[PDB]
Amino acid sequence: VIKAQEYRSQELNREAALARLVAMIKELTTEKKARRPTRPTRASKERRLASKAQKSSVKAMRG
RNA sequence: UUGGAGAGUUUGAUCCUGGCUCAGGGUGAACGCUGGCGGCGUGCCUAAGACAUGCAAGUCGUGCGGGCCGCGG
Ligand SMILES: [Mg+2]
Ligand SMILES: [Mg+2]
Ligand SMILES: [Mg+2]
Ligand SMILES: [Mg+2]
Ligand SMILES: [Mg+2]
Ligand SMILES: [Mg+2]
Ligand SMILES: [Mg+2]
Ligand SMILES: [Mg+2]
Ligand SMILES: [Mg+2]
Ligand SMILES: [Mg+2]
Ligand SMILES: [Mg+2]
Ligand SMILES: [Mg+2]
Ligand SMILES: [Mg+2]
Ligand SMILES: [Mg+2]
Ligand SMILES: [Mg+2]
Ligand SMILES: [Mg+2]
Ligand SMILES: [Mg+2]
Fold first, then answer.
1. Taking a C-beta distance cutoff of 8 angstroms, is the pair A21, A2 a contact?
2. What are the angstrom distances between the C-alpha of A15 and each of A8, A11, A34?
């Protein structure tokens, strides 16, 4: 239910009463998009850098 | 004087500080896998929520008057 109320002349009011329909239909019609997710790139270098130094100095003791 | 053990864990390494973690005993327990026997214990820590049926409190004729029936005539 749409009401186009502001012009003196009706056929302008219809021009606007209509397009409030059509452009409203488009908004509720087209919805977001593809795609997700991205996956991690440098976990090969980065985290096996941290498993490098971790294993080495781990052969120590104590605390 | 019948009683007192610690380890792992920050650093390239070190010493200190300091948290985290584990091995110990315990239980009215539960859960998983398994399950032969006996004894002594022990078993609603939740909803002091709600409950079917039976049973948990009576007895005395040597306190008193009755009624129902068994017997003596
Ligand atoms: Mg996305
Ligand atoms: Mg280290
Ligand atoms: Mg310590
Ligand atoms: Mg430090
Ligand atoms: Mg001890
Ligand atoms: Mg224990
Ligand atoms: Mg069995
Ligand atoms: Mg079984
Ligand atoms: Mg028993
Ligand atoms: Mg109960
Ligand atoms: Mg109780
Ligand atoms: Mg209590
Ligand atoms: Mg109830
Ligand atoms: Mg309740
Ligand atoms: Mg009884
Ligand atoms: Mg009397
Ligand atoms: Mg009598």
1. yes
2. 13, 6, 35
> Contact, A4 vs A16, CB < 8 A?
yes
Resolution in A: 3.2
Residues in chain A: 63
The first and second tokens of residue A45, run together, are 């270098």
Technique used: X-ray
User: How far apart are alpha carbons A63 and A54 in whole angstroms?
Assistant: 16
Q: How far apart are CA A31 and CA A25, in angstroms?
A: 12
Q: Provide the positions of strand B that have an atom within 7 A of a protein CB.
A: 7-14, 17-19
